[PDB]
Amino acid sequence: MGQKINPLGFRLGTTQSHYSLWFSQPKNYAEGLQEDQKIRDCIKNYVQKNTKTSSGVEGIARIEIQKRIDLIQVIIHMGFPKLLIENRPQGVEDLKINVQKELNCVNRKLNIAITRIAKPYGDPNILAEFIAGQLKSRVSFRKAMKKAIELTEQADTKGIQIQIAGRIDGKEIARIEWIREGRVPLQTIRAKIDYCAYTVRTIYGVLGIKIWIFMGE
Amino acid sequence: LRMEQTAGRLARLPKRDAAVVKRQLSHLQTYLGGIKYMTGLPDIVIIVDQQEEYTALRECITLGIPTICLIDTNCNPDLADISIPANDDAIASIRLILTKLVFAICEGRSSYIRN
RNA sequence: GUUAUCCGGAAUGAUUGGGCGUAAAGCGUCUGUAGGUGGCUUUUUAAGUCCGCCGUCAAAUCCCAGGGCUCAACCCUGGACAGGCGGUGGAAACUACCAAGCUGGAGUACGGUAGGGGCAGAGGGAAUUUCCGGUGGAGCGGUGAAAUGCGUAGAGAUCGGAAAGAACACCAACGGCGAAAGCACUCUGCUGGGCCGACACUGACACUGAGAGACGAAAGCUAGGGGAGCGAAUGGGAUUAGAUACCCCAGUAGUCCUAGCCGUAAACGAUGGAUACUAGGCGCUGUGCGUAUCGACCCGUGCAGUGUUGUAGCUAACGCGUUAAGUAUCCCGCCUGGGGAGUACGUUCGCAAGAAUGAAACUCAAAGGAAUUGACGGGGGCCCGCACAAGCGGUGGAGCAUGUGGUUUAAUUCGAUGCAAAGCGAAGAACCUUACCAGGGCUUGACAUGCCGCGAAUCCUCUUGAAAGAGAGGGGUGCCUUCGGGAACGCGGACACAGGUGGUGCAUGGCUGUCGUCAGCUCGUGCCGUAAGGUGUUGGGUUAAGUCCCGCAACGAGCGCAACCCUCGUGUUUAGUUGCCAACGUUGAGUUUGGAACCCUGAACAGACUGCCGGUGAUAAGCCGGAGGAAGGUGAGGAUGACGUCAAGUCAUCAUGCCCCUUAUGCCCUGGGCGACACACGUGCUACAAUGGCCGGGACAAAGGGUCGCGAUCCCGCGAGGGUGAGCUAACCCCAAAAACCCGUCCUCAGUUCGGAUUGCAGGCUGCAACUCGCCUGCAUGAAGCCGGAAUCGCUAGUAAUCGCCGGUCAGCAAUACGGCGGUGAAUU
């Protein structure tokens, strides 16, 4: 509704880089966005059947795609690399062919490497899948929001802010919840605040979480 | 603000911060030029006119700190424990009671010199 | 378990247990009978009271201890209790009775003081109105404006005189007096109360008080008088949608007097009277005293009377505060939910209008009081935005474009509609898009997965038909396996489902407008109040700004503001092509060698920070000017727009809850529709000219676009455009030769050598295809319109105004929509 500017969209020129950094000619630029969005929808969800399995349990932090000619970088930042890679080398093998069958035309030799994050309570993308995952299991809302505030402060941060929209605990009228601790400078560019947005399933309605994590100045 | 005023960081700091840091020092050396020397929480509080500074005695009785004052005629001695009935305006009256109170603190320590 | 019924909860009738300033509640104020209460001393009585005892208080319940039915219920012994009444023998302080007193209560006398206290009778001054006369002129009166009205049979105004009624300036005062109501020019007559002071005397003779008796602002009533002014009613004028109101001009009862009557009022300090006590600081009247009072005065001591940051205490709070709702005593009145009601009925009173006493049924679950936050206010104080003002241009008039209602239609699809709707979502609807209508068709079905059969899949297909489709024709059949079988794909079949721009965004996610770029919104600790909360975020100044300084129980901090980021304006460093090119050799075209200096270009760096000087200002902040500088006071201008307001908009972007349709609001195709009309409204464009039009010549721009593309040169056509076709994938090629402007000439203000709407005829171009629906060219026609009512909009500088160009959308709807670029260049504050 009447909120502040996107801290990932305001800080696009400096500090925080793009989730996809490449170059293409305006003739095959439209096909460049289609191939990068189709794989980002297939790696974030990552389920061939109609079940709630992989990718959403381990928590995806960032997906950086870099390309020049016929080769994509597709480096995924994960919290727990135990689910994506192996249980016996079969997990990353079916992911190597899934991205190959979709993107063809030219000889698309896709290499996918994996890197880790220091702590999952520093990045905004795990927090958007952790707190929103507590809405799926129907746990106490305001107790889960105050726990998401302290779990990031103990992970060494200078400020954190969390807020959703309406349809809380099965209420007919739409309300809003807001808890904040420390300082979060929403206007300044020398703040390097990261953002994420995730949707919830729910049989009564639909929720939408917004994460604001202030690192250094 | 005293340690960074006489260091090598003076030439690095911009003119926007150099005008605010000396303005903050100008307000911190005029008012806080008295309260500095000691750090601890007192057990006994001595004061001159407690009717003018009623905001100083009312905040000490709620914590449980014994109050002593140099009460005049325009004051009430009920909230005070041990009162000293004498003048508060004339400079001579303030000088006798306060220096002889300091001589009582210096007698229960070391060296009894002049005033 | 339900219902009925009593009690409890209800200290909501409270004797133990409550209240009456504002929540329900002191009767309007006095006098006073009965009744209640009553100072101090001694003696006495001892009635009340108290002690003990004797009777009676039936038994059985209840209670205590102890027994019997196996326990218990039940039954049972004794005791306790029966709180009471009477009698006898005592005690005697208190209350009461009797006797004799005392005095501080109360009362009286003596001598003085102040006062609108009251009644009666006189008399005084100003003014108003009216009557008469003089002078003199045409206006006067009145209102936010006007009109009714008074005027030349002459008012008003002015002067002289008369008549009459009422109230009586100043002094008047936060003043005084009175029981209340109430009462003020001066004087006289009769008369009441209060207070002080040396005292003299009685002696509690006191206080309160249902009923009762008396007094009662104004209005109103009866009879007789009076009547200047004011003024219910009433009559006109005006205002208004209407006003049988407010306002204007008149005006009766009444208001005034005598007598009688009615007895009511926010009859309010809304806090009944009387008495004794409890911190203080300023204002009246009497009296004592103060070197002889030498003085306006100084120090006490009484009455009555205000305010107080008024303390304790009391109070729900506001507030009261020794003239307390403080602490107590004596007695009387009154309340115990709101509406109905203070009405009905009855009694009493009255001439009447009505007054006094005072219900119920029914109905609601609430009324009410104080205070708090915020908002609102035709409340106030102080401040900021083109907000007004100052000023320029514009709209509404006109023709045309476009959007929306209404209307119409088979449909003229949907959504947005006060500002925050109205070229708005659709940056581009002839098919498509489209969702709507009509008609022709298919259904697990156009699209997804899974099972089975025939099969590779496809290409060219021929016939009918508007097409969607349907019937058959050949040509053709890759890659692996123990060939059984499969992947890719196709037709058909069965079933889950698939499918929905169907409803609900008052079920929702995401996102947005809006006040707002307004500048506020909050927290920690500590204090204030019982508390909800407040303080800090108030105040005095100051800025775009809780920006800053000072003051201040506030001290600090967080979000917002600012700054950090992007361009523009100066320079500097580095690097130079498709850029530029001073100096030097020139096919004059940087054109070539060459040169990097300058312009430009692209990354970095320097710089304004009120920082410096002066004045103003509270020796602060800040503002006003100046210096130095390309640039100053957030440099110009963007981006960025908090906690939140409107359950404002969007489930037709998408996603999602629920619901509904699912041989169907699902799906395919053809044609139509959305750019239909008697009208209305919004937003724009082109003109009414000649600071303009037209003809010819002619000087400079910035920013962007482009490979199913941008397209020069040349040829052809009057032109749009077409043929051929180079180069650029791009500061090397192209899209453009930018327009105002400027010189000369013509016209010379007549609806025109202004204006182009409209119309006919003939073409070009994009696409199956453009009649409805297109753009553009050529020829001709050539109106409305002469700057436009009420009302209303934007903008303060390089802005307004105006003149060209480019981009996105896109086959095509190219200067009229949106976005973007530059040229020229004000006005006023």
A99/A165 same-domain check: no
Protein CA A201 to sugar C1' C73 (Å): 68
> Resolution of the experimental model in angstroms, please?
9.4
- What is the side-by-side strand order in the sheet with B45-47? B45-47, B67-69, B82-83
* Burial state string for A86-101 with b = 16 or more CB within 10 A and e = fewer than 16: eeeeeeeeebeeebee
Contacts 24+ apart (CB under 8 A), A113-117: A113/A73, A113/A75, A114/A75, A114/A76, A114/A78, A114/A81, A114/A84, A114/A85, A115/A75, A115/A76, A115/A77, A115/A78, A116/A77, A116/A78, A116/A79, A116/A81, A117/A61, A117/A77, A117/A78, A117/A79
Same domain for A93 and A183: no
Strands of the sheet containing A75-78, edge to edge, are A60-64, A75-78, A114-116
Sequence-separated (6 or more) residues with CB below 8 Å from residue B45: B56, B57, B60, B65, B66, B67, B68
Flag whether A12 is in a domain.
Answer: no
Going by the DSSP 8-state scheme, the letter that residue B65 receives in this structure is: P
How would DSSP label each residue in A132-199? SSTTTTT--HHHHHTHHHHHHHTT--SEEEEE--S--TT-SS----EEEEE---SS-STT--B--EEE
> Do A112 and A134 reside in the same domain of the chain?
no
Residue position matching structure tokens 């349809």: A167
Q: Which of A72, A77, A118 is nearest to A99 (CA)?
A: A72
Could you tell me the strand order of the sheet in which A208-214 lies? A178-182, A159-163, A208-214, A197-199
How far is it, in rounded angstroms, from Cα A180 to Cα B96?
Answer: 57
In a domain, A33, yes or no: yes
Domain final residue, candidates A86, A118, A150: A118
Amino acid identity, position A133:
G
A77 and A135 inside one domain: no
- Dihedral of the alpha carbons of A34, A36, A42, A43, in degrees to the nearest 10: -170
A73/C222 CA-to-C1' distance in Å: 119
The nucleotide closest to A183 (CA, C1' atoms): C558
Yes or no: say if A39 and A105 are a contact pair by the CB < 8 Å rule.
no
Which nucleotide in the DNA or RNA is closest to residue A176, CA to C1'?
Answer: C644
Domain boundary among A118, A142, A174: A118
A12-16: which pairs have CB atoms within 8 A and are 24 or more residues apart?
Answer: A14/A189, A15/A189, A15/A192, A16/A192, A16/A194
Residue with tokens 């928590």: A59
* Lookup result for tokens 């979480």: A209
- Angstrom CA distances, B70 to A114, B34, B67, B75, B106, stand at 77, 21, 11, 10, 20
Same domain, yes or no: A130 and A111: no
Token duo for residue A177: 């919840």
Q: Which of B95, B65, B94 shows the shortest CA–CA distance to B82? A: B65
Which residues lie closer than 8 Å to A196 by C-beta, 6 or more apart? A124, A125, A127, A128, A211
The CA–C1' separation of A5 and C203, in angstroms, is 100
CATH code (residue A128): 3.30.1140.32
Nearest nucleotide to A195 by CA–C1' distance?
C510
Span CA (A145) to C1' (C363), Å: 52
- Helix (H/G/I), strand (E/B), else coil: A72: strand
**C-alpha to C-alpha distance for A36 and B85, rounded to whole angstroms:** 88
CA at A197, C1' at C635: how many angstroms apart? 41
Collapsing DSSP to helix, strand or coil, A86 comes out as: coil
Give the number of domains in chain A.
2
How was it solved? cryo-EM
Domain boundary among A88, A118, A148: A118
| A171 and A182, same domain (yes or no) | yes
Q: Which residues contact B9 (CB under 8 A, 6 or more apart)?
A: none
Specify the residue for token string 């996918």.
A112
Same domain, A113 and A145: no
The bases of strand C with some atom under 7 A from any protein CB are: 507-516, 526-528, 549-550, 553, 557-566, 608-609, 611, 639-649, 655-658, 706-708
Residue A110 lies in a domain: yes
Task: Note whether residue A194 is domain-resident.
Answer: yes
Does residue A196 sit within a domain? yes
Please report whether residue A173 resides in a domain. yes
Find out whether A84 and A78 touch, Cβ atoms under 8 Å. Answer: yes
Q: Which domain holds residue A182?
A: 119-215
CA/C1' separation A184–C669 (Å): 60
Residues A108 and A152 in one domain: no
State whether A64 and A136 are in the same domain. Answer: no
Two structure tokens written together for A33:
């966005």
| Partners of A197 in beta bridges | A210
Grouping H, G, I as helix, E, B as strand and the rest as coil, residue B68 is strand
Half-sphere exposure (CA, 13 Å, Cβ side) for A156?
A: 3
Counting other chains too, the contacts that B86-94 makes at CB distance below 8 Å and 24 or more residues apart are B88/B48, B88/B49, B94/B48, B94/B70
Residue B45 CB coordination number (10 Å): 16
User: In degrees rounded to 5, what are phi and psi of residue A98?
Assistant: -70, -35
Distances (CA, A) of A190 to A71, A124, A153: 34, 18, 20
**Strand positions, DSSP E, A21-64:** 60-64
For strand A178-182 and strand A159-163, is the pairing parallel, antiparallel, or unpaired?
antiparallel
Same domain, A106 and A130: no
Report the SS3 class of residue A96.
helix
Rg of chain B in Å (alpha carbons): 20
- Clarify whether residues A86 and A46 are in a common domain: yes
A190, burial (CB in 10 Å: exposed 0-12, middle 13-18, buried 19+): exposed
Q: How many whole angstroms separate alpha carbon A84 and alpha carbon A8?
A: 27
- Measured from the Cβ of residue A211, the count of other Cβ atoms closer than 10 Å reads 25
Q: How far apart are CA A66 and CA A112, in angstroms?
A: 11
Nucleotide nearest to A166 (CA to C1'): C508
Token readout for B63 is 């914590």
Residue type, A175: R
Query: Looking at chain A, after which residues does the C atom sit over 2.5 Å from the next written N, breaking the chain?
Result: none
Q: Which amino acid is at B12?
A: R
Domain assignment of residue A1, yes or no: no
Q: Is residue A98, in this structure, part of any structural domain at all?
A: yes
Backbone φ and ψ of A181, nearest 5°: -140, 135
Asked whether residue A109 falls in the same domain as residue A126, the answer is no
Q: Residues near A206 by Cβ (< 8 Å), separated by ≥ 6?
A: A167, A199, A200
